[PDB]
Amino acid sequence: TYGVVYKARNKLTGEVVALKKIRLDTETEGVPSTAIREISLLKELNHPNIVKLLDVIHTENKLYLVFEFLHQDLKKFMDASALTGIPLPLIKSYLFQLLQGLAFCHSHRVLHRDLKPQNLLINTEGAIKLADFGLARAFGVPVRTYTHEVVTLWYRAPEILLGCKYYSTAVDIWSLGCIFAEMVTRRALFPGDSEIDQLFRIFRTLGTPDEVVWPGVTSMPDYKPSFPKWARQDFSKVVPPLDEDGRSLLSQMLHYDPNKRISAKAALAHPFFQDVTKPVPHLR
Amino acid sequence: EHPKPSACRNLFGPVDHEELTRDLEKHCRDMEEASQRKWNFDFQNHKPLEGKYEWQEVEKGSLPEFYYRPPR
Amino acid sequence: VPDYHEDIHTYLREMEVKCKPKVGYMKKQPDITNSMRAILVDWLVEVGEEYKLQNETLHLAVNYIDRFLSSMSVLRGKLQLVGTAAMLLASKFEEIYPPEVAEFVYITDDTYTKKQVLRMEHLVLKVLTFDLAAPTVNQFLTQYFLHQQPANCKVESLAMFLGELSLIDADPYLKYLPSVIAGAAFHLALYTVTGQSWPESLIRKTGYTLESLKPCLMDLHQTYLKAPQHAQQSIREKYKNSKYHGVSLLNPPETLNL
């Protein structure tokens, strides 16, 4: 409550550790699933774009996790930077860094779910790292994990809202595309109140998902042909301050087909990423 | 119902409950040191034990919300 | 994912050696024998069939015990505790809705109290260092399945049967890596129902040839041919149902030309 966090710096030229406390009721199901899954999947992952789970300690009624310390989440930074807007080199850096971490996670059989801009942590060095792995679930192939509809509404893929049976690696790419398109304008693209209005907000920009663009939409459950015939908005207005190179990448990574959305390992060779360097933010 | 026919079946007869309890308890409280001294922190009761590490109190502000997120 | 599949397979191969029990770890145990491990795993399968648990949990659960009994000693009496806690820790990692503790206590006929199933999962999670994600013989057959013709039924179900028959007997299946056991299981059912041998697609991807699975094949056939006469008959009954194409009643092949 009061001492909710004990952030401990190091005196022997070491990193900064932070303490996350989990209180165990020890009455039913033992330790919760949301802790076991995160602890198991956050130790196999070691990339310079992921939080390092430095230590785990489990007492008779408490469970402490010693994490690396990152200064400012993306949400508060971009709230404070809304007046001047995120500079183009800075967002280029924050995209070339997150895509690396996402590709590494996908190649490491682990699937991230909720890429909320509150789950992305930056520091003074310009680095960025994925933070929250509680909803992460290892797949092996995308036909192993089922569906439970837990991810936050504003960042659900159009396939998840309609209801599927198995996930894929395109959910993370969709969320990453939303964040990219959203930091250029400093406005959440699709702030729907519920799933139905979220769908109606998605269709307004990318055009109604005709069978020409989406082969597997007609037979999809929770899809109906009584859908508005909204046009495909011109991308020159959806995000005005983008360069000529950035026109294509936002469109490929926001694609409809879950088997077409550009893979993270393939997004790093797209002509948008040609000259990327890391500046320092406003004191993190 | 008289308990499930196939699954409900004792395997290796009776056991000693008291000895089992003390054996589990020992090891439960044995988990100390090499972490309590590595992080020089009294993890038993959330006490910042003195040492090289500088444990500090942090207000909920000026800090990412990831470090005090209640489980859902 | 055909983009990341190669990297996932390489990572799985690399990780298969860390999450491995030591061979011949149990003869050192002064209270239990293989006739007890087989009984425990049999009871595990019977429980899993009566709770609608996913087949991935079983393969995981029997792994944790193999990484627990070879690290910390256990008496004869509290082995069922280890099995129950292994199921509890496996189901809270692979199942969407983990069953409650009271149900597991009810399963063992109220021999272990609710506070007793815990304080053991308390113990298991630290001896393994919280490394629960262990590659197993289900996670490898899944990768090998998508190369045995685009559409082939009754192959992805007998192979699972031969993979599950592995866990019952420690001798001599505790030596082969999961990637070799899965390869032998895949190339036995395929020869049983279809006829083609070890696919050429998976002899240039996994690196194994059909010569370097001969020990695994000769170990798996004997179990295939004796399964109806085994002392623990629950997996055969489990796969007798029509959910898995009823392959448990298929005639085993007699001889091989490998």
Numbering used by the authors:
A (entry chain A): 14 to 297
B (entry chain C): 22 to 93
C (entry chain B): 175 to 432
Task: Pull text from the paper.
Concomitant improvements throughout the p27 KID were also observed, permitting modelling of side chains that previously could not be discerned. Analysis of the p27 KID (residues 25–59) allowed us to model p27 engaging with the RxL binding motif of cyclin A and follow its path towards the CDK2 activation segment, as reported in the CDK2-cyclinA-p27 crystal structure (PDB 1JSU39). The conserved LFG sequence sits in a deeper, more hydrophobic groove formed by cyclin A Ile213, Leu214, Trp217, Arg250, Leu253 and Gly251,, which also constitute van der Waals contacts with the p27 Leu-Phe pair. At the second region of the p27-CDK2 interface, the p27 β-strand (residues 75–81) forms a hybrid β-sheet with CDK2, creating an interface that is dictated by hydrogen bonds between p27 Gln77 and CDK2 Lys20, and p27 Val79 and CDK2 Val18. The final component of the p27-CDK2 interaction involves the p27 310 helix (residues 85–93), which binds through the catalytic cleft of CDK2 into the ATP binding site. Additionally, we were able to identify other key p27 residues; Phe87 sits deep in the active site cleft wedged by CDK2 residues Lys33, Leu134, Ala144 and Phe80, whilst p27 Arg90 hydrogen bonds with CDK2 Gln131.
